[PDB]
Amino acid sequence: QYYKIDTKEEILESARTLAYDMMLFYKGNQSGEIPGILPGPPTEHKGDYYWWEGGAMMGTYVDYWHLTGDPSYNHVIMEGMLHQVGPNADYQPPNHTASLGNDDQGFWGMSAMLAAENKFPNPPDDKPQWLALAQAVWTTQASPERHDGTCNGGLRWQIPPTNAGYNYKNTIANACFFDLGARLARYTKNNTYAEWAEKIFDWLYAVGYIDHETWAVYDGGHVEHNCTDINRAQFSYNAALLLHGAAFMWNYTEDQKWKDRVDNLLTGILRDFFKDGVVFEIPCEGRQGACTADMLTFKGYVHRWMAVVTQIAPHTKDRILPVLRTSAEAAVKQCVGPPTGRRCGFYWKSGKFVDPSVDHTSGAGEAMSVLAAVSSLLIEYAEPPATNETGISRGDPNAGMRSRGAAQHF
Numbered sequence: 004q005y006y007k008i009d010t011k012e013e014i015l016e017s018a019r020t021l022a023y024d025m026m027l028f029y030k031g032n033q034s035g036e037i038p039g040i041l042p043g044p045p046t047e048h049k050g051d052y053y054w055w056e057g058g059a060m061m062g063t064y065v066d067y068w069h070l071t072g073d074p075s076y077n078h079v080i081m082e083g084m085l086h087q088v089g090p091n092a093d094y095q096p097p098n099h100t101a102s103l104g105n106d107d108q109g110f111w112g113m114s115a116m117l118a119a120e121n122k123f124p125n126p127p128d129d130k131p132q133w134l135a136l137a138q139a140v141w142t143t144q145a146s147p148e149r150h151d152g153t154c155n156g157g158l159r160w161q162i163p164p165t166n167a168g169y170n171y172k173n174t175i176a177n178a179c180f181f182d183l184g185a186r187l188a189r190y191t192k193n194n195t196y197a198e199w200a201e202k203i204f205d206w207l208y209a210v211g212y213i214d215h216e217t218w219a220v221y222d223g224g225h226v227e228h229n230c231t232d233i234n235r236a237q238f239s240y241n242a243a244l245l246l247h248g249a250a251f252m253w254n255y256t257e258d259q260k261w262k263d264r265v266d267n268l269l270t271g272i273l274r275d276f277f278k279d280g281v282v283f284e285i286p287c288e289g290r291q292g293a294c295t296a297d298m299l300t301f302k303g304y305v306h307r308w309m310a311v312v313t314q315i316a317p318h319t320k321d322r323i324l325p326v327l328r329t330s331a332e333a334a335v336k337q338c339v340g341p342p343t344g345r346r347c348g349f350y351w352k353s354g355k356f357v358d359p360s361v362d363h364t365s366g367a368g369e370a371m372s373v374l375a376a377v378s379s380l381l382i383e384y385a386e387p388p389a390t391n392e393t394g395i396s397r398g399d400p401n402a403g404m405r406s407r408g409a410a411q412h413f
């Protein structure tokens with residue numbers, strides 16, 4: 004094993020080296036390149052990664068600085084986050100229409116929310132501010148044309164009606180909107196965010212994407228079948244994102260129903276995704292060559308989000324932190340690949356380095372996931388998410404409501 008994680012100082016050093024190796028994949032700060040994205044999209048043969056994964060990377064580094072205190076990458080990350088906001092400061096840049104799912108937009112909004120929660124340095128005065136960006140994403144996702152009567156509600160996966168997948172109402176789109184609403188409620192103390200979060204969670208439960216008996220979290224269903232053709236694939240990030248949002252709602256409302264939802268979601272996650280203490284991507288990890296670029300990132304989000312759950316729902320700490328520790332130990336045990344002696348693969352439970360080429364990418368998602376897992380080992384030393392009581396960001400009462408906003412020509 005190359006990385007050591009047995010003391011705070013060892014974790015900090017390992018996380019710093021992991022942050023370096025992940026950054027080697029990113030070219031957006033170099034002359035002639037585009038800030039905020041990893042190489043891609045594969046549809047243009049420019050690289051392996053889609054736009055939303057750039058947004059996920061930005062958030063991973065906002066968390067990295069929050070957890071470690073290392074500001075080395077903060078200027079690169081600020082540049083990337085600001086470059087992708089679009090003309091209406093809503094993370095809907097029209098050049099990226101083909102990638103404009105509600106989840107894709109949502110992940111950028113969640114990175115902006117995280118920047119506000121973590122007191123990440125503010126953009127210049129003339130540029131969109133982190134809270135305002137999160138508010139704009141949430142507001143566009145609450146817009147009436149995104150909430151029709153099919154399946155009695157819920158967001159569709161895609162924003163443009165002509166995008167493939169507009170007929171799929173999936174968990175992740177709804178989970179992103181839920182999570183944003185719960186987090187905006189806690190930060191701003193505005194109850195309208197919370198009422199929408201409640202509504203969307205209740206929809207996910209009613210439609211049966213949350214299993215009423217086991218609290219497994221399925222993938223979605225199609226409008227032409229009234230959402231009854233449930234795709235029962237269980238992706239780790241769907242259950243973990245609902246757990247995260249539910250924890251924010253528990254912290255904000257102190258309503259026992261939310262504590263029960265946290266506990267039930269958590270029981271399900273530990274049962275389904277943790278194998279002998281190691282996170283495992285059950286729909287694809289069971290054999291090599293099946294996980295897509297998107298799926299290689301999910302276990303990193305699981306780690307970072309579950310770590311935050313322990314701060315805002317502290318009764319969960321003893322159930323979560325020991326399991327994240329064993330999962331991160333497995334992550335680092337397999338970061339031993341050539342040519343560096345520290346290259347990271349994905350198959351943590353297996354105990355062995357597998358070249359990311361088996362899953363047809365250069366390995367950025369695997370690197371991101373190990374960075375997230377190791378950094379989040381420092382959660383016990385970190386401040387909890389800030390609210391507007393101590394945060395430094397600024398909001399916008401008209402976020403998402405500009406006259407040139409895309410909803411005005413839907």
Ligand SMILES: N[C@@H]1[C@@H](O)[C@H](O)[C@@H](CO)O[C@@H]1O
Pocket residue numbers: 053055101102103104105107161166297
């Ligand atoms: N429109 C979809 C996005 O929502 C999705 O995230 C990417 C990656 O799967 O493929 C397409 O671009």
Ligand SMILES: [Ca+2]
Pocket residue numbers: 045050051363364365
């Ligand atoms: Ca490829």
